[PDB]
């Protein structure tokens, strides 16, 4: 009906809550919001990998599903009137990105380094038609070229090179608040602390830096240092180079989710570390055990149902295991009644 406007703020959340003719081989599943509610997107094998999106709760069956675009890396979100999807298809050295708007292709973007073009593999954020998308091309264990592409009505308005102090950017998760978008993701090459990118679609610009929190949120990682730095990356850990995650940052209303093990993708916990944006000596408060150390975890992402009938946005998250869990709660406070 009307283009979405990021005006409602992000109020405090205390404790997380449970929200989550056959199934296909679904891998890399994320969640995307729309005026009708929330849907789950996943890549399925049917050489012909395709995205399939289904309603919350319902099992993936060939009666309530719809394909967005064809590829192996992808992203998608909504702007209030239409849904914008991006997929990457083609050979590894000649990858091309196809953009779909209201179910038909509208734009093709070619590669610029020719070494596996990839996207954020999560949801995107749309503000008054401007929908930033972060893409990367090049080595996954060295310097790579990262660009930010701004879409509107399925058309390009600006492609700009990455700025700031970020060194490696892959598979990012973005959330919008107060008109500004914050994207948190993986440093696959050197750092063990996640970078953060601030995007302003008003002035049509972005800036990049790191997280100042001393609580590292990547796997693998070393023991948490005394003074987490947000200008230069912190290197360590073995053998895993990194894992996709997320982080909500609203000063005192901050949440960081990380695997239990410092070397393996086992378990999942969260911490309310106050002032995750700037504080270097910050320490966590509210703990909540989401996934125990016994079973395996995977890629974790963040999504917000901006079209809620509330004065807030009520952020939410998902963690993979295989199956996955989508969780988010309210001001109700932690206790023996929470899981």
């Amino acid at each position, epitope marked *: 009906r009307t283009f979405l406007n990021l005006t409602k703020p992000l109020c405090e959340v205390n404790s997380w809550h449970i929200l989550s003719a056959h199934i296909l081989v679904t891998r*890399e599943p994320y969640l995307s919001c729309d005026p009708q509610g929330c849907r789950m997107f996943a890549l399925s094998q049917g050489p012909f990998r395709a995205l399939i999106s289904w309603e919350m709760g319902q099992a993936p069956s060939p009666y309530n599903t719809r394909v967005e675009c064809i590829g192996w890396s992808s992203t998608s979100c909504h702007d209030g009137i239409s849904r914008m999807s991006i997929c990457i298809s083609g*050979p*590894n*050295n*000649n990858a091309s990105a196809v953009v779909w708007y209201r179910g038909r292709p509208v734009t093709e973007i070619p590669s610029w380094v*020719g*070494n*596996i073009l*990839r996207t954020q593999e999560s949801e995107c954020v749309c503000h008054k038609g401007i929908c930033p998308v972060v893409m990367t091309d090049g*080595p*996954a*264990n*060295n*310097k790579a070229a990262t660009k930010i592409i701004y879409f509107k009505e399925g058309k390009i308005q600006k492609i700009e090179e990455l700025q700031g102090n970020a060194q490696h950017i892959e598979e990012c998760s973005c959330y919008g608040a107060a008109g500004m978008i914050k994207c948190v993701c993986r440093d696959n090459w050197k750092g063990a602390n996640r970078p953060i990118i601030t995007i302003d679609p008003e002035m049509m610009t972005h800036t990049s830096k790191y997280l100042c929190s001393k609580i590292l949120t990547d796997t693998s990682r070393p023991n948490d240092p005394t003074n987490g730095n947000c200008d230069e990356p912190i*290197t360590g850990g*073995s*053998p*895993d*180079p990194g*894992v996709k995650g997320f982080a909500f940052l609203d000063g005192e209303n901050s949440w960081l989710g990380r695997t239990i093990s410092k070397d*393996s*993708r086992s378990g999942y916990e969260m911490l309310k570390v106050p002032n995750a944006e700037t504080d270097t000596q910050s320490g966590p408060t509210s703990y909540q055990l989401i996934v125990n150390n016994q079973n395996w975890s995977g890629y974790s992402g963040a999504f917000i149902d901006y079209w809620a009938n509330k004065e807030c946005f009520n952020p939410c998250f998902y963690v993979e295991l295989n199956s996955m869990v989508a969780l988010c709660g309210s001001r109700e406070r932690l206790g023996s009644w929470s899981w």
Partner: antibody
Amino acid sequence: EVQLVESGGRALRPGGSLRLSCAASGFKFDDYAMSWVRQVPGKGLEFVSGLNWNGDITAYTDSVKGRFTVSRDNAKNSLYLHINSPKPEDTALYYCARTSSWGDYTRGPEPKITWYFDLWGRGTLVTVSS
Amino acid sequence: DIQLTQSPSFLSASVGDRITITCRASQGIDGYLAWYQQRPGKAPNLLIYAASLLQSGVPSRFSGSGYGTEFTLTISSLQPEDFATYYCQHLDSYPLFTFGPGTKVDIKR
């Protein structure tokens, strides 16, 4: 410009120890992998060993797995290959090669080591005879 | 355990002629293959990587193609500097980075 200089290679006797040194100049030392590739004076090139920027991942071939040492010193910007317990099959010319990666996008926890060589050097001779 | 045999072993061709070389593997290796040129008594230099991408400094008369078990390299026009040996290297063979046996090209008699 880009330059790799090899030194320390010489003929030696079985049961000895040798050290081969590689000096790099003209590029970012700590943002690239480095490897050694050997070639007998009659046949083609053969891979022996290599490593990444921080030394976390090291590769040795089957025939030198138990008798080769590979290290790098970024403070001195140098690469060192130590050969112990030589055999008469290790008479060849060694090249120090700057190594990069292509198609290393792995979703799972295990890193993918796909390597190709771009910059080479003059090489040093290593002959093992009784 | 991936084989790598390249043909022809020896080939004599005049200057400025169509010359192509084929590297073959036992099983499909995707685009994980590179080509190296080594002049007589010179250090080898990388020509193409990923079976289609040219290096920054190499001339534009070297072309590569292929996806699977067969890879082809073609020199657009032979040059006096083009008399050398050629090797095909596999990439995803940790830690046995296989090289080709070697193809040598000389002046036709």
